[PDB]
Design an enzyme around this catalytic site. Structure first.
Site, PDB file in Angstrom:
ATOM      1  N   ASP A  80      -9.263  -4.277  -6.187  1.00 48.49           N
ATOM      2  CA  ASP A  80      -8.823  -3.552  -4.999  1.00 48.49           C
ATOM      3  C   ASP A  80      -9.927  -2.596  -4.532  1.00 48.49           C
ATOM      4  O   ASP A  80     -10.397  -1.750  -5.297  1.00 48.49           O
ATOM      5  CB  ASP A  80      -7.524  -2.798  -5.314  1.00 48.49           C
ATOM      6  CG  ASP A  80      -6.799  -2.314  -4.073  1.00 48.49           C
ATOM      7  OD1 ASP A  80      -7.455  -1.793  -3.153  1.00 48.49           O
ATOM      8  OD2 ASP A  80      -5.554  -2.431  -4.031  1.00 48.49           O
ATOM      9  N   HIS A 136      -7.339  -5.644  -1.365  1.00 47.12           N
ATOM     10  CA  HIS A 136      -6.156  -4.850  -1.053  1.00 47.12           C
ATOM     11  C   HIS A 136      -5.164  -5.609  -0.203  1.00 47.12           C
ATOM     12  O   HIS A 136      -3.958  -5.604  -0.482  1.00 47.12           O
ATOM     13  CB  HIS A 136      -6.582  -3.550  -0.392  1.00 47.12           C
ATOM     14  CG  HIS A 136      -5.484  -2.528  -0.292  1.00 47.12           C
ATOM     15  ND1 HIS A 136      -4.866  -2.017  -1.371  1.00 47.12           N
ATOM     16  CD2 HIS A 136      -4.912  -1.915   0.816  1.00 47.12           C
ATOM     17  CE1 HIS A 136      -3.940  -1.123  -0.972  1.00 47.12           C
ATOM     18  NE2 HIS A 136      -3.974  -1.062   0.364  1.00 47.12           N
ATOM     19  N   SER A 191       0.830  -1.204   0.000  1.00 44.12           N
ATOM     20  CA  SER A 191       0.000   0.000   0.000  1.00 44.12           C
ATOM     21  C   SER A 191       0.871   1.263   0.000  1.00 44.12           C
ATOM     22  O   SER A 191       1.767   1.375  -0.837  1.00 44.12           O
ATOM     23  CB  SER A 191      -0.958  -0.046   1.193  1.00 44.12           C
ATOM     24  OG  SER A 191      -2.039   0.844   1.022  1.00 44.12           O
TER      25      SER A 191
END
EC number: 3.1.1.3
Length: 314
Positions: free
Chosen positions: A182, A219, A107
């Site tokens: 995502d 994610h 991330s």
């Protein structure tokens, strides 16, 4: 090709503070064999991002995993979070006998890594490769929010500066693994330069491009899945510094947490996002994007941050 050159910008934080944010498994950064630097996601510490996945997985691949934990839970200014990473690379390069080291991220961690490589020239020769899982180089399109959440919003001054300084092109050999599905970072659907995880000249691996349009990982799964492990392993082992298409295929398309993780690690890996959401809820929040540091401001003239509109810098 990144535009900034010359001396590194100064750190805002003292070296002792930055050092305090770095930990290696069973080793000091001053004396470490085959370190890998792990950079965590928004709302997490290093252990929270990686205990259930890349800490044990990189260990089993023969690395000593090291990580940074910029306080509070990666919610502060991404520019400050980057100081921890830059200092860590300087430390780990020297501590491993002046040997380049890989950087592996989740991330925001990928954005941090690329920010560091863009604006701190000294580490460009010290990072061997970058393996970024669900990075948000263009931020995400998805009344107060965390400093780093502002900066990761598409259209932010920070993402503007990264782009305009040349940061949307890879600086070291880079693999980006991401998912069209995502739920945190979008847009990611196109399998093209439109995607937030995409770097020019990078090895950009959208999971659905390999596994099919209906393959689903979120994610967190982008970091934790068996498929993600196989791509990551390829990137880490590759003589080109990038994952190789020959090293993975349709048979590796397992969306569940990496096979080699213990049952306890698998459960924790599946629940990776929950602590992050909790930290975001309880963390610092403001109604404006943090000011760009002087080194970055020339690249986002016209953008508005907390102090006002960025003007040209003499």
């Amino acid at each position: 090709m990144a535009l900034p050159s010359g001396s590194d910008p100064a750190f805002s934080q003292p070296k002792s503070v930055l050092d305090a944010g770095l930990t290696c498994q069973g080793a000091s950064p001053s004396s470490v064999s085959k370190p890998i630097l792990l950079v965590p996601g928004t709302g997490t510490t290093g252990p929270q991002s990686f205990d259930s996945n890349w800490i044990p997985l990189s260990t089993q691949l023969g690395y000593t995993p090291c990580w940074i934990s910029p306080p509070p839970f990666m919610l502060n200014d991404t520019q400050v979070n980057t100081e921890y990473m830059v200092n860590a690379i300087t430390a780990l390069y020297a501590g491993s006998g002046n040997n380049k080291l890989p950087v592996l991220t989740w991330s925001q961690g990928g954005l941090v890594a690329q920010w560091g490589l863009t604006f701190f020239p000294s580490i460009r020769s010290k990072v061997d490769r970058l393996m970024a899982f669900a990075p948000d180089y263009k931020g995400t399109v998805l009344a107060v929010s965390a400093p780093s959440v502002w900066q990761q919003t598409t259209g932010s001054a920070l993402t503007t500066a990264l782009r305009n300084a040349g940061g949307l092109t890879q600086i070291v050999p880079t693999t980006n693994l991401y998912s069209a599905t995502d739920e945190i970072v979008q847009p990611q659907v196109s399998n093209s330069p439109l995607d937030s995880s995409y770097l020019f000249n990078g090895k950009n691996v959208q999971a659905q491009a390999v596994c099919g349009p209906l393959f689903v990982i979120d994610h967190a799964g982008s970091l934790t899945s068996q498929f993600s492990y196989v791509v990551g392993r390829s990137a880490l082992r590759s003589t080109t510094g990038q994952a190789r298409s020959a090293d993975y295929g349709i048979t590796d398309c397992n969306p569940l947490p990496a096979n080699d993780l213990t049952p306890e690690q698998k459960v924790a890996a599946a629940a990776l996002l929950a602590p992050a959401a909790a930290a975001i809820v309880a963390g610092p929040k403001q109604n404006c994007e943090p000011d760009l540091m002087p080194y970055a401001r020339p690249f986002a003239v016209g953008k508005r941050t907390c102090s006002g509109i960025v003007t040209p810098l003499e």
